Amino acid sequence: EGLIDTAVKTAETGYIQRRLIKSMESVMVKYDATVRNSINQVVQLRYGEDGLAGESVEFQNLATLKPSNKAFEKKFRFDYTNERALRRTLQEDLVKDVLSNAHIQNELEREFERMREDREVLRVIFPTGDSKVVLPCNLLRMIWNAQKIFHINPRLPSDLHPIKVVEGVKELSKKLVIVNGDDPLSRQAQENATLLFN
Amino acid sequence: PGHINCIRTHSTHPDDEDSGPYKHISPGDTKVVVENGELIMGILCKKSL
Amino acid sequence: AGILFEDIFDVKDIDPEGKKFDRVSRLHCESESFKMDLILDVNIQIYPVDLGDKFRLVIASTLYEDGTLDDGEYNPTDDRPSRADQFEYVMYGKVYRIEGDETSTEAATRLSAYVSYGGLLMRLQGDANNLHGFEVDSRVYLLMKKLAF
Amino acid sequence: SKTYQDIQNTIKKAKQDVIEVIEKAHNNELEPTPGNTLRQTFENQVNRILNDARDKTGSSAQKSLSEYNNFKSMVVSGAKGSKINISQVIAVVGQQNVE
Amino acid sequence: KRITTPYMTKYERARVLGTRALQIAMCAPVMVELEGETDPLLIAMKELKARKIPIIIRRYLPDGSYEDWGVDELIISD
Amino acid sequence: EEMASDELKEMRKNLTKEAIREHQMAKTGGTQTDLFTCGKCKKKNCTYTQVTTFVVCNECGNRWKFC
Amino acid sequence: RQKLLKEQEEKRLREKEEQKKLLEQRAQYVEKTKNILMFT
Amino acid sequence: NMLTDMTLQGIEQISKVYMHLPQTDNKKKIIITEDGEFKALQEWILETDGVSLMRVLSEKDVDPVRTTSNDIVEIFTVLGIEAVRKALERELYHVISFDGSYVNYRHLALLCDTMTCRGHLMAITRHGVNRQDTGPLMKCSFEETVDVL
Amino acid sequence: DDEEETYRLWKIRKTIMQLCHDRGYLVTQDELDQTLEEFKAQFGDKPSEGRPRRTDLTVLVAHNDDPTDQMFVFFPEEPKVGIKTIKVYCQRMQEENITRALIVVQQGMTPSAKQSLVDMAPKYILEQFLQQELLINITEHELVPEHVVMTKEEVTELLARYKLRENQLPRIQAGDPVARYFGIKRGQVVKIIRPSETAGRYITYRLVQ
């Protein structure tokens, strides 16, 4: 049987494999960054709906998708009220900022609301609770590289101010541009194309 | 090369090892850990190479 | 100085999991003045030990008795005063984890410093004050030596 | 030899179990599995018994192999072969299917 | 108002390097110091790193418009 | 059916119950175990089969393998 | 708390909008049932 | 004819209907709990050896949201070209991943997009890709060589 | 069975309401959400000759964005309507400026009836569904993403941002089930918002042709 199927798999499968290529030979990614064909009919507006080359993406996990509505809160919320807890992670000056500055506190709350909305989004994108996703940057390995390059020692209290995280990520979301433009249609499609990575 | 970081489980890694103790000090030297481009732990196999 | 930790120890089990390797055995050992715990892999082929073997274990930051930091390269050809000269089994390794019972509010009471000696693992576990000399990703030397008692 | 004795005992039990399933079918005592014909029920029962036999024997074989065994070392590296090859070489080649 | 990616794609990099190396092999004046090499592809690669390749890249958009991009303006990737 | 003899009612009930039992799909066999924790639902109700260990969670239907 | 109250009463206005659109739609259905009649 | 042809029950194409309780999680029902957990439910699902998708979806107590046809042509007539894109993508992914292998989604999305780009199911055949208005020198490269020329 | 017919007609009516409101033909929520119970109560569970009878099951209804844009929805008395039969309705339509008429034909039109339909259509755009197709809202299906009909103003902006001729967009054929659901016509463009596993969301456009 294996010797027969070896021979048989040869003939058909290659036919399967020419027809595909002839159907798709000229489909390519234009400088518009859209995926068109010979006659220039637009097949995809962005390559793969995201505009990213297939090599550079990896297997990551969506942290917010799985967890319960309570383990999500105690993990993505950054309570500012536990002064004792803050002085553990944050230095003695950052805590008094976080402990006192109403703008800091409300900005952190706004961030948590944004994560909560992203969570509901993810749960409409990935029902069945499938945390495993394919995305360009390996964030957890970049973080781990950061811990190993600057010698973090995750046991001393850190000097990274929370809102420097918030605003740094906000500003980073600006530089990961897939659909270039300031037009509402282009800001919308940039927001969509970089929605899961964001 | 460089400072790679990755974690892998050697093919024989017993699945009940990450639950009990010895989680980070594996009896059978499964659990490949590379840190700063340094093989700290674990046997390498197809799962890691 | 660079002496990070020292205690009397004794071996209280070897390979409780069964002998996973032929030249390497898990030692499960207890300290005596601090009653910390140790899980150490020794090259049981060139340095055999048995249950109830008592030993000094001096985990040190550097071999040199003047405490000058080594560069971490193997050189031989060296006169300098070296702690190794008064031990029997010396290993060199990378502290790769420091777990502990940290809570969200108040610090760990106990730490488990994990060290990899080129792949031979050690976990030293006990009250944190004896482990304050350990920080993750730091070079250390094992310098153990059996007490004839 | 203890491993071979275990393998042979397992196969003997599996052969006896298949004989008993045949007896159950011959006497019309074998109630069909839902959806299956009685023949499909019988064939599923026998295939399950014999797959379980081949698997149990393959495991008992693998469980016998020392860390020195050079099939084990090529398998657990993933370099060549697989646990089913160790099984077929040591324990039992198993059911030969066509189509 | 150039809207294309500001990065030199790997196709533009392959073609630019081969074309410039051809021009060098035809005794074109080099735009970079030769520390003593003679392969036209090695020179073309050095010029690429120096961003001194005297070539602009006309990227056609699917509407049939085009954009011209120097080889010092866009960000060379590798 | 409601006017039938008690014997004929019980016969019809038995035939209906047997027809339902015959049309029930066989539950896929395997060794039930609590050794495996499901990565999706975190429950321990799993079934395994060795051929490589294939594992199925009986609660969420998640499937995975060990080599 | 005051912001919550004003949001609540805004939601009540948004309900009233649908209520009055329904009253509109029934208002034209009274005219149009006549049309259905003369048609049917 | 009445014996063979007169339908007492069912619908003419549904030659037989199985009845399974799903064991995987991919034909299970998934329901976000009140607490946010996912909690895959195990609900009875039917299957068939024939297809009559629109009539089946119409049935009471059939789920019209989830019921699907394993037949890209049927789904085209009932659910239209974009549902065809999704269905075809899922069937193709099913055949590819069934053996445990994995292919990036870009290549599946791209194939299913080319096959659905013109609003009908564009077969990947002379009958399908030469109907496309690509231009004669491209169609002769494939099939019907001189006929297209 | 008047009972099963009652269920069918209710299900159709609800689906029709959803179709309308997705077109933006205004439906009250209490009509759009109708359960079978208020259906039965209103129509008396007697389709053939009671109050659910198909021509009195009609509605005369208006678009939400233009209350003068009005559709007279007819379940025909004739399961297979004819020219005469559609024509008389158009006769009584003609008394009013109303034009649209979604026809919920059971068997579909006689092809002659279909011709009379398309003849009067450009003045009174009567349009046909087979009630079978209305037992289910296909846009409810998990495979059917969110279609949205673009306005001509924003179709032009779409073609202008990408610098893209309407000839180069993907196509959807006007007979497509969802195209018919939305009632779109040739040269119109539908926005389609898909969940995407690589991007999270993908908006694609299909021109009706």
Side-chain angles (χ1 to χ4, degrees), chain A, chain B, chain C, chain D, chain E, chain F residues 4 19 26 29-30 39 61, chain G residues 27, chain H, chain I:
Chain A
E1 304 292 321
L3 297 167
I4 294 164
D5 309 8
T6 301
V8 166
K9 293 176 301 180
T10 86
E12 187 155 59
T13 80
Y15 193 43
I16 320 296
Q17 188 180 5
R18 76 168 291 88
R19 302 204 307 279
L20 292 171
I21 313 157
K22 302 302 300 172
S23 85
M24 274 190 288
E25 54 189 346
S26 47
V27 177
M28 72 182 303
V29 174
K30 303 293 177 143
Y31 280 100
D32 195 5
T34 175
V35 177
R36 326 224 189 183
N37 60 352
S38 41
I39 55 178
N40 243 17
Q41 299 157 348
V42 54
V43 173
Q44 296 174 345
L45 285 159
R46 298 290 133 157
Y47 181 39
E49 308 169 346
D50 54 0
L52 316 151
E55 307 94 330
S56 308
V57 305
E58 325 191 15
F59 280 103
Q60 323 219 46
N61 254 270
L62 305 163
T64 62
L65 181 51
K66 293 287 208 175
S68 72
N69 287 318
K70 181 186 288 184
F72 171 68
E73 184 150 7
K74 67 183 58 178
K75 206 206 177 173
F76 302 97
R77 185 78 184 264
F78 195 80
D79 70 336
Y80 50 81
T81 54
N82 191 326
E83 177 169 26
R84 302 186 45 87
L86 290 169
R87 272 92 69 77
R88 309 296 321 287
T89 69
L90 305 191
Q91 303 189 330
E92 308 306 323
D93 52 355
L94 271 61
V95 298
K96 57 178 68 178
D97 293 354
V98 170
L99 286 160
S100 66
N101 188 315
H103 171 68
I104 299 299
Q105 293 175 352
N106 286 284
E107 190 69 32
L108 274 32
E109 267 308 311
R110 197 164 330 116
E111 153 162 277
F112 180 76
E113 306 164 0
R114 198 181 304 109
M115 283 190 258
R116 205 215 317 282
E117 303 173 345
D118 307 343
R119 191 161 159 274
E120 321 307 330
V121 170
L122 286 182
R123 304 195 146 179
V124 309
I125 313 310
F126 309 105
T128 85
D130 217 356
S131 170
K132 215 200 213 181
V133 81
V134 184
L135 289 181
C137 294
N138 206 227
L139 300 182
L140 292 168
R141 198 205 325 131
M142 290 197 207
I143 305 166
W144 190 15
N145 300 340
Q147 324 200 55
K148 295 287 175 295
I149 297 181
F150 310 94
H151 305 133
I152 284 301
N153 193 308
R155 182 164 291 285
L156 305 188
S158 70
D159 64 355
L160 176 61
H161 200 300
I163 55 58
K164 294 288 165 188
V165 183
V166 183
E167 86 185 5
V169 175
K170 281 178 160 182
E171 289 169 26
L172 177 60
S173 283
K174 306 281 182 55
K175 308 200 204 54
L176 319 172
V177 294
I178 295 289
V179 184
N180 194 8
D182 272 351
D183 185 314
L185 204 83
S186 148
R187 265 182 282 105
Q188 175 68 258
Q190 156 65 23
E191 191 271 346
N192 284 341
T194 315
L195 176 75
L196 213 57
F197 188 78
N198 274 308
Chain B
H3 319 313
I4 312 177
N5 303 285
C6 76
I7 306 188
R8 304 293 285 187
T9 48
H10 175 48
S11 186
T12 66
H13 180 68
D15 59 282
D16 66 336
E17 185 179 278
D18 293 306
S19 322
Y22 319 136
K23 179 178 184 174
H24 305 293
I25 182 157
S26 59
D29 206 30
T30 79
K31 199 68 165 283
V32 173
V33 175
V34 178
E35 256 181 36
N36 271 319
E38 296 184 47
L39 182 61
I40 311 309
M41 298 171 57
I43 289 157
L44 302 181
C45 67
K46 80 156 295 282
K47 302 296 186 186
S48 65
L49 291 176
Chain C
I3 299 304
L4 303 182
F5 171 70
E6 183 274 337
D7 203 356
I8 308 293
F9 276 77
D10 71 304
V11 183
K12 292 210 184 295
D13 212 338
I14 72 99
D15 301 318
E17 321 85 349
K19 184 171 176 182
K20 290 282 182 277
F21 295 115
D22 305 347
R23 329 170 180 79
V24 178
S25 59
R26 274 282 202 274
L27 314 184
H28 291 247
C29 317
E30 305 303 317
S31 75
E32 281 281 65
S33 72
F34 294 93
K35 308 309 301 169
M36 310 178 63
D37 312 50
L38 173 70
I39 310 178
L40 171 66
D41 302 344
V42 309
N43 199 341
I44 206 64
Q45 199 186 50
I46 71 191
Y47 198 75
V49 286
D50 302 325
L51 287 75
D53 284 353
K54 302 181 68 174
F55 57 100
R56 179 173 69 188
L57 173 141
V58 179
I59 290 171
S61 180
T62 187
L63 297 172
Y64 301 113
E65 299 177 295
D66 69 12
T68 312
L69 261 289
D70 52 296
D71 62 7
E73 190 186 342
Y74 181 62
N75 61 280
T77 55
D78 212 329
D79 293 27
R80 289 170 49 68
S82 179
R83 291 168 177 137
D85 306 333
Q86 59 263 17
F87 294 91
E88 308 169 352
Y89 185 75
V90 183
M91 304 186 81
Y92 173 75
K94 213 271 292 200
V95 185
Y96 71 92
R97 192 179 187 90
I98 302 185
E99 199 66 26
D101 64 316
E102 306 89 51
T103 80
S104 50
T105 79
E106 61 89 41
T109 66
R110 292 173 65 88
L111 300 178
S112 301
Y114 294 75
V115 186
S116 178
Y117 298 97
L120 290 170
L121 308 181
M122 183 204 78
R123 182 178 76 176
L124 174 65
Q125 173 173 16
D127 45 325
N129 307 78
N130 319 333
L131 284 171
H132 286 177
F134 293 75
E135 63 257 24
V136 57
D137 290 33
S138 62
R139 308 305 218 248
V140 290
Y141 294 89
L142 185 68
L143 308 141
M144 67 186 269
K145 157 172 199 171
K146 226 173 321 192
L147 306 175
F149 78 86
Chain D
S1 62
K2 193 265 294 189
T3 310
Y4 290 127
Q5 193 65 68
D6 186 21
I7 290 159
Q8 294 302 317
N9 290 354
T10 302
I11 290 164
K12 185 183 297 184
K13 186 178 292 185
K15 290 164 66 87
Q16 180 59 30
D17 293 335
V18 172
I19 287 163
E20 286 175 29
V21 168
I22 285 169
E23 177 69 15
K24 201 178 183 180
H26 287 180
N27 298 350
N28 215 135
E29 298 176 54
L30 182 66
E31 187 64 15
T33 294
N36 288 342
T37 64
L38 192 148
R39 284 179 187 275
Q40 287 290 1
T41 302
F42 170 81
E43 289 282 72
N44 283 19
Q45 291 274 358
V46 173
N47 283 341
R48 283 198 296 100
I49 292 160
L50 297 175
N51 276 280
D52 295 346
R54 185 251 285 100
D55 296 351
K56 179 59 178 286
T57 55
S59 179
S60 73
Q62 293 165 61
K63 288 176 66 176
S64 80
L65 305 189
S66 62
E67 62 285 349
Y68 291 105
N69 179 288
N70 295 277
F71 283 81
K72 193 191 181 81
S73 74
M74 285 185 280
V75 167
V76 306
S77 57
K80 197 61 62 181
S82 68
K83 289 175 179 286
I84 187 159
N85 303 114
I86 291 174
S87 183
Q88 296 186 311
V89 168
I90 309 191
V92 63
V93 183
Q95 185 57 263
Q96 307 299 309
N97 317 280
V98 295
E99 284 155 13
Chain E
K1 50 142 188 173
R2 301 186 301 208
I3 70 158
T4 47
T5 183
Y7 294 97
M8 194 191 284
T9 83
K10 63 170 172 298
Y11 311 115
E12 300 162 12
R13 194 174 36 93
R15 203 170 156 196
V16 171
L17 285 166
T19 310
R20 182 56 176 162
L22 182 54
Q23 294 172 1
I24 301 166
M26 295 161 146
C27 301
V30 295
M31 303 292 163
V32 80
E33 211 49 61
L34 282 59
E35 63 89 22
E37 63 270 18
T38 48
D39 188 12
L41 239 170
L42 299 180
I43 309 170
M45 203 77 208
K46 183 177 291 179
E47 283 188 349
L48 187 47
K49 302 293 101 176
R51 313 167 73 82
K52 291 286 175 67
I53 291 178
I55 288 171
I56 87 172
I57 314 171
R58 175 160 288 181
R59 294 174 165 177
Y60 296 110
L61 280 63
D63 72 338
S65 190
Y66 66 82
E67 297 187 0
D68 292 345
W69 288 80
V71 169
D72 53 353
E73 291 168 63
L74 37 63
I75 314 155
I76 57 179
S77 53
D78 268 348
Chain H
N1 78 77
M2 90 173 68
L3 176 72
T4 47
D5 313 347
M6 197 193 77
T7 301
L8 300 181
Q9 246 179 1
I11 69 191
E12 283 62 32
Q13 306 85 357
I14 304 301
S15 57
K16 77 191 301 177
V17 186
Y18 308 127
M19 189 181 163
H20 210 276
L21 266 163
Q23 316 299 324
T24 63
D25 296 5
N26 56 37
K27 311 185 200 293
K28 271 187 181 194
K29 179 174 178 71
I30 308 288
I31 179 61
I32 297 65
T33 76
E34 309 314 315
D35 59 57
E37 286 293 350
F38 267 110
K39 194 198 188 307
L41 303 183
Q42 200 181 4
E43 305 295 76
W44 283 106
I45 73 178
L46 322 178
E47 299 169 31
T48 67
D49 289 340
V51 157
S52 197
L53 173 67
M54 179 164 57
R55 288 176 75 188
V56 180
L57 292 168
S58 83
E59 289 299 325
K60 55 172 56 175
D61 304 323
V62 170
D63 186 331
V65 178
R66 302 186 71 207
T67 293
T68 184
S69 198
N70 192 26
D71 182 350
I72 64 184
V73 180
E74 188 79 338
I75 286 167
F76 185 26
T77 63
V78 182
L79 302 175
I81 189 61
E82 197 69 1
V84 173
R85 197 298 196 150
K86 192 71 196 165
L88 174 59
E89 179 243 291
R90 296 201 308 197
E91 302 328 325
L92 178 76
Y93 174 74
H94 181 60
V95 343
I96 283 166
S97 62
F98 161 75
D99 73 358
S101 71
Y102 162 74
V103 177
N104 210 335
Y105 170 84
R106 297 160 168 75
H107 315 305
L108 303 169
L110 197 60
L111 170 64
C112 301
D113 286 346
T114 76
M115 288 172 69
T116 61
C117 195
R118 293 293 101 193
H120 53 57
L121 273 171
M122 193 277 286
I124 286 170
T125 76
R126 60 190 164 292
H127 324 293
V129 304
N130 294 4
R131 308 303 76 87
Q132 191 149 27
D133 55 331
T134 46
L137 284 184
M138 187 173 270
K139 311 169 194 173
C140 74
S141 301
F142 182 43
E143 292 184 19
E144 312 182 320
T145 299
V146 82
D147 194 31
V148 302
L149 294 170
Chain I
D1 182 356
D2 296 323
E3 180 58 42
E4 292 299 311
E5 189 161 329
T6 303
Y7 178 98
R8 295 164 69 200
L9 294 173
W10 164 65
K11 199 67 162 65
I12 302 152
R13 194 175 194 83
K14 197 210 295 180
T15 307
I16 287 286
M17 297 310 173
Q18 293 165 356
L19 175 150
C20 292
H21 223 72
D22 292 342
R23 295 175 176 206
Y25 260 82
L26 176 58
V27 191
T28 66
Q29 188 59 228
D30 298 2
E31 286 167 310
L32 180 59
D33 71 12
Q34 64 185 259
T35 95
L36 182 60
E37 307 311 322
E38 55 266 42
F39 187 101
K40 286 169 171 292
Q42 185 168 4
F43 312 111
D45 208 2
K46 197 61 174 181
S48 312
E49 306 298 332
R51 274 60 178 170
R53 69 172 298 293
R54 287 168 61 92
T55 36
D56 302 330
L57 202 67
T58 192
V59 300
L60 179 53
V61 66
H63 205 289
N64 192 45
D65 79 33
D66 179 4
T68 75
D69 179 6
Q70 294 175 22
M71 190 190 298
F72 220 162
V73 183
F74 304 129
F75 295 72
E77 285 151 334
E78 186 79 301
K80 191 181 180 178
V81 302
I83 299 177
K84 266 296 205 300
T85 89
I86 84 168
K87 174 177 175 177
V88 67
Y89 298 179
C90 199
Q91 211 142 3
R92 293 75 183 93
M93 288 266 289
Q94 193 163 8
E95 290 66 5
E96 291 76 39
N97 74 337
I98 74 185
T99 72
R100 309 209 64 121
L102 193 164
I103 325 296
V104 187
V105 199
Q106 184 172 353
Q107 314 297 359
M109 292 225 176
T110 314
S112 59
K114 299 182 182 180
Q115 309 322 304
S116 172
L117 167 139
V118 300
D119 186 24
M120 300 302 279
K123 53 175 65 181
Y124 326 113
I125 190 56
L126 74 166
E127 64 180 294
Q128 186 201 230
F129 292 84
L130 288 62
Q131 90 184 20
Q132 185 61 227
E133 305 185 304
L134 302 166
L135 296 165
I136 62 185
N137 187 339
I138 66 179
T139 70
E140 215 84 320
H141 198 287
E142 72 171 27
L143 293 172
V144 178
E146 182 158 38
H147 292 69
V148 176
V149 187
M150 296 174 102
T151 79
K152 186 176 291 183
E153 199 279 329
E154 64 190 1
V155 177
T156 89
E157 179 57 37
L158 158 69
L159 310 175
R161 194 273 173 200
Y162 303 111
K163 310 173 187 298
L164 186 139
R165 312 179 302 97
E166 40 274 58
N167 179 241
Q168 322 179 333
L169 292 169
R171 310 276 175 80
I172 179 170
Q173 62 188 26
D176 174 284
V178 183
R180 288 191 291 121
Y181 186 93
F182 285 98
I184 61 192
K185 68 178 189 286
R186 186 176 290 224
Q188 204 161 21
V189 178
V190 205
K191 207 219 286 176
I192 310 160
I193 313 133
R194 299 207 294 250
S196 167
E197 66 161 81
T198 51
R201 202 178 302 108
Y202 187 62
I203 298 185
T204 187
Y205 316 91
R206 299 202 165 226
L207 178 138
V208 184
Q209 181 162 1

